[PDB]
From a paper:
The [name] plasma membrane H+-[name] ([name]) is a member of the PIII-subtype of the P-type ATPase superfamily. It pumps protons out of the cell to maintain a steep electrochemical H+ gradient and potential across the plasma membrane. Structural organization of [name] encompasses a cytoplasmic headpiece formed by three domains; the nucleotide (N) binding domain, the phosphorylation (P) domain, and the actuator (A) domain, as well as a membrane domain composed of 10 transmembrane segments harboring the proton binding site and the translocation pathway. Additionally and similar to other members of the PIII subfamily, [name] has N- and C-terminal extensions involved in auto-regulatory functions, the latter being considerably longer and referred to as the R-domain.
Author numbering: 12 to 844
The structure:
Amino acid sequence: VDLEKIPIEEVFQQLKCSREGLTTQEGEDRIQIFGPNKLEEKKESKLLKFLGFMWNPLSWVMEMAAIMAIALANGDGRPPDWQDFVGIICLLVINSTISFIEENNAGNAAAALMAGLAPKTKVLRDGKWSEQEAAILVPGDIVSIKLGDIIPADARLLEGDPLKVDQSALTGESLPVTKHPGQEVFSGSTCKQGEIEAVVIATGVHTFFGKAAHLVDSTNQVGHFQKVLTAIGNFCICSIAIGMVIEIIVMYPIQRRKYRDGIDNLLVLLIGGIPIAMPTVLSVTMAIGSHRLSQQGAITKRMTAIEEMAGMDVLCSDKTGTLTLNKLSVDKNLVEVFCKGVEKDQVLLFAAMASRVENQDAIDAAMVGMLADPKEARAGIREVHFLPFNPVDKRTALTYIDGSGNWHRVSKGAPEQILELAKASNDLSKKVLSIIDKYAERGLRSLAVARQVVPEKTKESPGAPWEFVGLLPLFDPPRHDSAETIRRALNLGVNVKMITGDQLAIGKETGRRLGMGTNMYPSSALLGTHKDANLASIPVEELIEKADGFAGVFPEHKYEIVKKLQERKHIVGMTGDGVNDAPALKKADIGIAVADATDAARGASDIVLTEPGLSVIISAVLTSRAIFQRMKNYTIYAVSITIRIVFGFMLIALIWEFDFSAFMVLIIAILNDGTIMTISKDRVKPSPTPDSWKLKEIFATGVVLGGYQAIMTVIFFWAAHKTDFFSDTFGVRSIRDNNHELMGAVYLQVSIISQALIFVTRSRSWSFVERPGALLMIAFLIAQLIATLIAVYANWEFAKIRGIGWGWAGVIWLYSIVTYFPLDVFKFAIRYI
Ligand SMILES: CCCCCCCCCCCCO[C@@H]1O[C@H](CO)[C@@H](O[C@H]2O[C@H](CO)[C@@H](O)[C@H](O)[C@H]2O)[C@H](O)[C@H]1O
Ligand SMILES: Nc1ncnc2c1ncn2[C@@H]1O[C@H](COP(=O)(O)OP(=O)(O)CP(=O)(O)O)[C@@H](O)[C@H]1O
Ligand SMILES: [K+]
Ligand SMILES: [Mg+2]
Ligand SMILES: [Mg+2]
C-alpha cells in the first residue's frame, strides 16, 4: 500500500508533499486541474437524455392519446387525427420547454443554496488560516481539523494530542476510535473529540468509501413529496377513466352511437383532463421557496422540508443557542473565591488565561474581554500547551512557564467536572454547590476556575493536586425578539418548548423573563418509565406534551423527548448545535441546525439556518406556510379544472349528442399551460394554523368547484341550443343547431371560467377582496384576449369552429362574469366543512 494501514509516516509527507503547512495556492491548482476532486459526477448527464425530454406517467397517457387518434383513424384513413397528433406533440414540446427551462432557472438560483450546504474544509494557505470548500481540497497537503468537522479525505494525523473519530455507518461500529499522530483517518468520519493538524492523503473517490461504491441504486426512493404528487396525478387520471373508459364507452352501445367518429369525446377528456402542468408547477414552487428561504436566512438542505415546516406543531428550542444571545457577562460582586490568596478581581484573569484568544468560543471571547484589556490575558505568560473544550470533559486548561522557569497551569470548566480534578473535601463541595444553586436561583450559569503547579516541569506529567480557585456567575442574556417570537409562534400555532442542559432553576428563571411559562421539568425525571415521579397520575408522554420545556437535557434524553412528542402525533421542530444533537436532529420531523452549529449537526439536520435565533425559525415557518398555501391552491385548481373538463364535454355528449372539438380543448390546454407559471410567483397569505396537506379536502374543494363550472357550462349549452333564451335577450346573432358557431361559444365560455378559477382557488376570502397582482391579471387578460379573438374570428373547418361575433362574445363574457361570483360562495361552502 502507498500509505493506508502501513505507517510510512513522516517519510510519506516528505517523499510526496515535499513541503509543510503553508503550501501555496498555485501548487494546489496544478494538481486540482490534473484530476483530483472530491467525488464523481452522476451518470446520464450526456446528450440531454432526460434534460430535454420528459417521461412521467401523465406523458405516457398523453402518448397513448396521440397514438389513439392515429390508432382510431386507421393510420392515414382519417386526416384530422394526425393534425391533432402533431398538435398533442406540440403541447408536449411546449410543456417540456417551459418545464425544463424553469427547473433549470430554479437550479441556477439554488447554486448559492447548494454552495451554502457543501462540505467545507479548513486550511492554511500562504500562511493564512482559511476555510474552503471540500472540492478545492488537494490530496497530499496539510489541513487543520477541529471538533465536529467532517473529515473530507483520507488523512494522516500530523502532531498533537490523540482525538476520537466516529466511523459508524462507514464501518458500522458504534464506538468512536482514538486516533494518534501518524495514524490514518478516512473521509466521512466525524470527530467526537479533540483537535489536531493532519496531512490529507487521497480524495473521497480513492477513499475506501468511494472504492466500496460499485453500482448506483435507488437512494431515498420513498420520498413523500413525489408520492403525494403522484397521488394528485392518480386522482385526475382516475376521473378521466371514470369519465371516458366507463361512461363514454358505456354510452356507445347502450344508445348505439357512432363508433369511429365518437372517439373525439374520449380524446377531449384525455387532452384537457391530464394536468401535465401540475408536476412542474409544484416542483418549481418549492425551488423558488427555497431561494426565498435563502434570502430569509434558512438553507433547505432538504428541499421537501417546506411541507413539514408548514405542518410544524411544536418547536423544541435550545435556550443557549436560539433563545439567548451567548455573549455571557459576569458581575464580579457575586464572584466567590476559595483558596484565599487569590482574589475576586484576579480569578477572572485565570479564566481569561484558560480561554483561546484568536478564534474564540463565545464564553472564551467574553472572558478574554471581561478584564477590559485583552493584552492582559496573554501578557508575557509564555504558554506551552492548551487543552481545548471536550464535551465529556467540560474543561479547558492553559500550561505556561513563568518567572524563573516555574511551570504553572490554570483551567476553566463545568464546576462538577472541575470539582473532580482534585476530589475536594465535602465541606468544599457543599459550599461550591450552594453558591452554584444560588447563582441558578439568581438565574446565572456557573463556570469554575482551578490552578495547579507541575513540579516535574514536563508536558506529560500530572501537576500538583488542583486548587479549587473559585467559580463565577454568567448571565445568558435573552435576545430582544425571542420574547416576541414565542408569542408570535403561539399565535401561529407552534408551541415553543425550552431545551437546555442547565438545571431547572436557570431555565425557569430565564424562561420567566423570556416569557415562556415555568411548567417545565428535568428531562431525567421524565426519561423512560422507570423513574416514577407520579407517572401513574400523569403519563410521562402526557406530561411531556403539557411541559413547557425540559432542563438538564442530555443527548439521549433529547432524542427521547422528540420521540415522545413525535409519538404524540405532533410535528416536532427541534434545534441543534453539537456532535451529539445529530440523532435527535435526524429523527426530528424538522432538524434545525443553528447558524454556528457544528458541520456534523448541519449534515444531520433537514434544514440549516445561516442566521441566528428563534425569530429566524418562526419567520421561516411563517414564510414556509405562505409557500405551502399555493401548492394546495394550485392542487385545488388543477383538480377543479380536471373535473370541469371531464364532466362538461361528456355530459353535453350524453344529453345532446354534441361532439366537442379536440383541437379547441388542445388550445385551452396550451393557453392554460402558458399562464400557470404565474401560480408559483403568487403572493398568497400564510395559513395561521399549521396544515398537513390533506388531499381529500383539496380534492373536495376542487371537485365541487369544477362540478359547478361544468353545470354552468351545461346550462350555457342548453340556453343556446334546445331553448331560445340566449338569443331571446339581445340576440345579435341566434343559433341552435349551428354547431361550428355553437362550440366556438362553448370554447370561449369554458376558457374564461377556467382562467378565473385561479382567482377563486388562490383566494381564501372573496376573490375580488384579495388583490390578484399584475402577473395573474396579465396572464388572464392576454390569454382571454386570445381566446376571445379565436372565438370571434376563427373559421376553421378542421377545428369544427366558425367565428361568432364580438356582440355574442360579449354576452359570453357577461355570462362568465355573473357565473364567476357564486364560485366563492361554493368555495366557502365546501371549505366550511
Ligand atoms: C371571521 C368572521 C368574519 C365575519 C364577517 C361578517 C360575515 C359575512 C362575511 C361574508 C361571508 C364569507 O366570509 C368568509 O367566510 C370564510 C369562512 O368560510 C372565512 O375564511 C376563513 O375560514 C376558512 C376556513 O376554511 C379559512 O380557510 C380562511 O383562511 C379563513 O379566512 C373568511 O375569512 C370570511 O371572509
Ligand atoms: N469553552 C468553555 N470553556 C470552559 N467551560 C465551558 C466552555 N463552554 C461551556 N462550558 C461550561 O460546560 C458546561 C456545559 O457547557 P455546554 O456548552 O455543553 O452547555 P449546553 O450545551 O448544555 C447549554 P444548552 O443545553 O442550553 O444548549 C457549562 O457549565 C459551561 O459553563
Ligand atoms: K430528520
Ligand atoms: Mg462553546
Ligand atoms: Mg448546546
